[PDB]
Amino acid sequence: GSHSMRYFFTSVSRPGRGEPRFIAVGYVDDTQFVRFDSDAASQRMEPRAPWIEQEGPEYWDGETRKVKAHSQTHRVDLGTLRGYYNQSEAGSHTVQRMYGCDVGSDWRFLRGYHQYAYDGKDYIALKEDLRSWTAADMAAQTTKHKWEAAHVAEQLRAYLEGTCVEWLRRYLENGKETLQRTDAPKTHMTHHAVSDHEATLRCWALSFYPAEITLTWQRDGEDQTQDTELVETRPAGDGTFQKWAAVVVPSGQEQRYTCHVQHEGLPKPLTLRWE
């Protein structure tokens, strides 16, 4: 199956006394493997997955070094951005940055991307060609012209297309037993009587990995997008995910409803009924 390595940075300003909060997390597909928190004791990049604990001190000194260098770049940003938006020094503000690379099932590069945000809205992003930039505001355009001059896209492309995909492939084989393993959803249905003449039919998908799942309900063979309640996929807390799809059925006719589960670890999709 395909794979991705992504980094999420969140810098939040605390106007009044010190420094921003800087959170950084790294993910290989839906497994998190590292973190850095500005207010954590260590002041180092910490292992959040067993297969990365076996990395060298040199790795951990390199990654601790880069992530806090990255922290300070964002600290300058919250001020500069405040300048760009003519904002006061009394209000808290948030910068988010996300970049990563996608590799196919051949482990040969697919996409690269870098997007940046101010106060939960888009600010600037690298386009799918890894050459040009999408600037949102006129402030974002000043950043575009800076990064255009400093040749950030040319450097960033080399990262996404080179050392990202390389170290991603490495993670994959080093944590093979978890990362390259598809946990198929453990399905089952339930039936609660809503009244004397109606019932909720709820279809479950539990302890699956990766997070991608298409849970679909249908009646007599045709899709039932109506009277379906579909919750967003949630973490179970052990690294697998969960999800349910429910439909309100008139009593005595549960037999015509089928739940359909599609997930990367099922050779053929599941069709389960209630009887």
Binding site: A69, T73, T142
Partner: peptide, 10 residues
């Protein structure tokens, strides 16, 4: 594995 800070500030 992280890139370096080739990113200028904004």
């Amino acid at each position: 594995f992280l890139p370096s800070d080739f990113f200028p500030s904004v």
